[model samples]
Target chain A: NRREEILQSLALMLESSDGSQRITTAKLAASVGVSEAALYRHFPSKTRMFDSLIEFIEDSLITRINLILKDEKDTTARLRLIVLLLLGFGERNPGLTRILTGHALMFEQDRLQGRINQLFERIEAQLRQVLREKRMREGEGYATDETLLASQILAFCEGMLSRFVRSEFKYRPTDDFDARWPLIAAQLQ
Target chain B: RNRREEILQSLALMLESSDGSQRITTAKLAASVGVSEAALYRHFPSKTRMFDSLIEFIEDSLITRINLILKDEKDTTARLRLIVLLLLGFGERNPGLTRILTGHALMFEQDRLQGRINQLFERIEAQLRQVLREKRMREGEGYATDETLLASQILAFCEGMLSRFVRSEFKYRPTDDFDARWPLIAAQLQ
Candidate 1:
């Protein structure tokens, strides 16, 4: 419980700090009501603490995504909802948005960003699967490249998240989503 | 001529290279050019000011090219498509500018610099909005969505391309598979 609490507090601090400000161990320890020594007892290093956060993100998003995949059959709907899931996730969790958009991990180890990129690739894999289904159904008329489309959809999701974080959360990822879904949906179909 | 242009060129080149991770500092930049920090300051009042100049260059060059595209292309769909292609092409051709536009270069810099980048996107989004509106007008009653939503989607897609390029350390060129991929994007707008 204490370890979980420490991680939770650190994420909130990263969330609240100005986008570019580095979170020091001293500040994080103070925020969590623990001494620097106490922080290390729970997590071996600051980098480890961040890795836990990334793990938390991956677990949270992927678990929910798997559920979506299991329940949804319409390929287009799955893709649309998946994109929405990403945007909605970012909007709800601003701190995690920084990590997702690479702002929080900017000054961290390259491995941190690589972990997040893997999360993106996982999402893209899901997209490619749904797109392949659509391609088979539509037959020869579907002219677009599945890999490119999947990558582009992931890019748009990232772009919206990027805007949301870069604007300091002023730009909501969910903004205009309902209106814009058809435009995006039409393309994927 | 003026040394200011040379200084800005060096800054852009530095930003374009892999060394962009090393945040811009007066001492390093001056050392790179064989000039003193004071000499660098003489050309620009602050580091943020130099960044603003680079942004201005981007804004000017893009707007001018977009204007030409708008003037020459009569079809609303073609105009919208060309603008997006131009944006990705520009990023591929100028990797450093993509960093600035995507806010990766401005990450640790002044807040105002980021604000300016936001404004730059707003301006670009506005251009997209205009073409989208023209599309609606020409299509009469059959347009499926409002102008703002369509414009926002296009702008986000373009921004996404740039973000991928920068995040991949310029290995993921924005223009890759552009021909095959563009039709899908064009279908979205129409």
Candidate 2:
């Protein structure tokens, strides 16, 4: 349980930092009133501890996104929601999202980083799916073009996440996030 | 008190003026204040604490202004003004902060830069949420999605500013001709 305290505190610390930020494990361990050996005791490895936080964010946030599509009928709305949801999450949890996006890369954990990349791709796939749905519904389908639209939207959203993380959560990414997507959705088709 | 503030002011001064090309050592800071290294530490316990003092200054000055802007302005447009005002004007005036902001401050201690920069970005998005809510409330119904839309665009523009500013060697302002371009940006949400 004490180890869980350290882990949660470390996550909070990471959540408080920007893309390029990191705390020394020694200092991190000390902050939670434990020795470095103790930190390694439960986790066995620093990388594993980092992965735990990454998994927390992925499980807590990304899983719900699947449900968002369960009820929405409009493809465009779904697409817009996907982007909006991401930016919104960034607004609320700028630090973790910074880790989620590639802005603040954490070294020594290439596998964990790859999982994050997969998460981004997962979100991108959802966006692409929604885009395809829009094209099909309009009878103006363009399957190949979905990738470009998804990329641009992803870029825009990452830019948002980056700025949000960079601005120390002072500037909200969701401020006008929902309002702007209609234009993006229109331009996509 | 005077010495601490003076030392912090000098730190801020050196931070904005130092090009990314060099490291800021204790000797450089002392020279900026016309003091020896030992004399510099007399005011603060360590160099890191001095940096912490500067960070605290930044938090105090910027947060007050942001809260004031949000308090007085009730709508989305005004909220954006505050955002632009903060990102562009504040950045332009505080090149030193930008240096810290852009990770230039971490030339000596790279790890510190990431954590500080992360905190800054988080604050930016929270403010965006406020304006987003304002816009949604004012426009109502179909405007429910304003937060994500404007947030993303505002962020893009802000990044474009930083990229341009860095490329310009901090010569350019993020708020340049914002009035002309903002309309085009506002059109995105519609």
Candidate 3:
């Protein structure tokens, strides 16, 4: 519980940072109302704290994604829901959104970046699975590389989130979802 | 004349070498150029202003070419093609500037840097919307689709490509599979 509280506080600190600000341990400890030693007791190092946050993000997002997949039947709806969920997640969690887009990892350890990249790779694979399922259901009439299609969609999604984070959440990731969805859907068709 | 240009050049080089990891602090920047930090400040009022100067160079470099292309290229389709090519190609050639262009380098800096980048994209999209509207008219039909949507999508994709390039440590080239991807991307405008 204490560890989770520390991580949550750290994320809040990150969200409040000015566009390009980095947080220090003293500040983080002060905000958490704990000594620097207390902060270390929960996590071995500052990098570990960041790692814990990334792990939190990965677990939360993947669990939600899996739940979406299991509940939704229509493949198109499944794909759309996944994309919307990602944007929604980012919209709701601005600090986590920064981490997801790799902005928060800047000036941090290299491993933090590598973990985020793996998150993207996994998400890309999940997108490919749904897209491929949709393709197979259509009886082979629609021929395109599922990998490429998934990548394109992921790029668009990532681009949208990137814009949102860089805009300091001024630009919503879900902007024009109703209007934009059809265009992207048409591309899939 | 030379010192100011040299300072800017070294900033770019440092940004490139660090792959966006190292912030451009005055002490490190001066050391790279064999100059005093005071001398660095003499060239520019502040580090933010120094970055602004670099941004000015980027804007001047690309916008001039964009304007020329817009003027000379009559076909709307060709113009769009060339513009996307120029953006990706510019990033490919200047990896460090790609970091700045994508806002990765500017992320921890002053808010104005990102504001300027946002303005840059808005301008690009506006230019795209104009050309695309012409393309629609050339077809002798009403506007085919939402022009803003298409333009923004293109810019977003371009921006995403830059993000991937920088985040991947420049391993992912923006121009990768260019010949193949263009037709598919251009198809979206139709």
Candidate 4:
């Protein structure tokens, strides 16, 4: 319980950090209401803490996403819903989204960028699975090119998300995703 | 202020002269403008705002031309062409504007980088909506509710071009493949 609290507080501290500075252990401990010793009780080191948060985000976001896929039957709707869900998550959790999307990491540690890249790769895997399912159901073709299609979708999604963050969230990430899905879906299938 | 303009121009010249490998600094900039370092401060105050001035020039120049393009737009095709032309023309003429609009200016500035870019996209979307509305009025299903995404892709292409142009100095035109690509993008995306 205390460890989870520390991680939660660490996530908050990471979120609080601006482009100007890295999150100091002093700041992290202060934000979490713990001593440096107490903070390290959960993780071996500060870098591990950062890595832990990355792990948590990937696991949490992907697990719920998998659950959504399991319950939904329509492949097209599943894909559409996944895009909506991911963008919707960003809308709801602006801070985590910042971390997950690399806005915060761009100015911070180099390794953090690697972590975000891994998150995106994992998301791509999930997307590829969905595309394969869509192809299987259609029985038309393009399963061979599914990864490329998935990569394009993944890149397009990130490109739009990056625009949203750089645009300071003025434009909603899901704004045209709803309308564009049919056209894009046809292209995919 | 005479040298300030010159320093700004040096920034432009350096960006225009070489690929991005050439780093422009206040020292280098002052030298290019034929002024000493202290003199540069006497005029503009800081390197960031000097970069900001270039951004302002870009905003002033492009927005004026964009208004002209938006003025006569009786339909989407005309508005889209003007938007494309305005962007390509600005990139062709102002090397610094290309760097600035492509987020190179924000590489140093903390907050303004993303904010200014967001503003650029908003303007593009506003122009696009004009066309989408015309189609909707014709009872056509080709309307964009998330003008933001369409704008993002357009911005992506713009960024891609600016990236290529600046990376190649002024040798490569932003419009090199634009004529063919523009129609393909419109036909496919719409």
Give the alpha-carbon lDDT of every model: 0.82, 0.65, 0.81, 0.64
DockQ list for all candidates? 0.62, 0.12, 0.51, 0.10
For model 4, residues B81-173, the per-residue Cα lDDT tens digits are 678667877888887667666554454455665566667656766766655556656545664435545555555545545544543345668
Worst 10 residues of 4 chain B by lDDT: B15-24
Interface RMSD of 3: 1.9
lDDT (Cα, tens digit) per residue for candidate 2, span A59-107:
7667767887886877767767777777777667655765665434334
Q: Please compute and give the TM-score of the first chain of candidate 4 against the native first chain.
A: 0.80
- Candidate 1 pairs with clashing backbones: none
Of the candidates shown, which would achieve the greatest DockQ relative to the real structure? 1
Clashing pairs in 4: none
Query: Second chain of candidate 4: TM-score?
Result: 0.82
Better DockQ candidate (2, 4):
2
lDDT of 3 by residue, A59-129 (tens): 98799999989999777788888888888888888888888878778767878988988888889889888
Candidate numbers, best DockQ first, in rank order: 1, 3, 2, 4
Q: Can you tell me the CAPRI class of model 2?
A: incorrect
Query: Model 1: per-residue lDDT, tens digit, A50-168?
Result: 89888988998888888888898777778778888898888988987788877777667767877887888888887887778775765643456788878878888888988887788
Best by lDDT: 1
**Candidate 2: lDDT of A70?**
88
Docking class of 3: medium
Cα lDDT for residue A17, candidate 4: 30
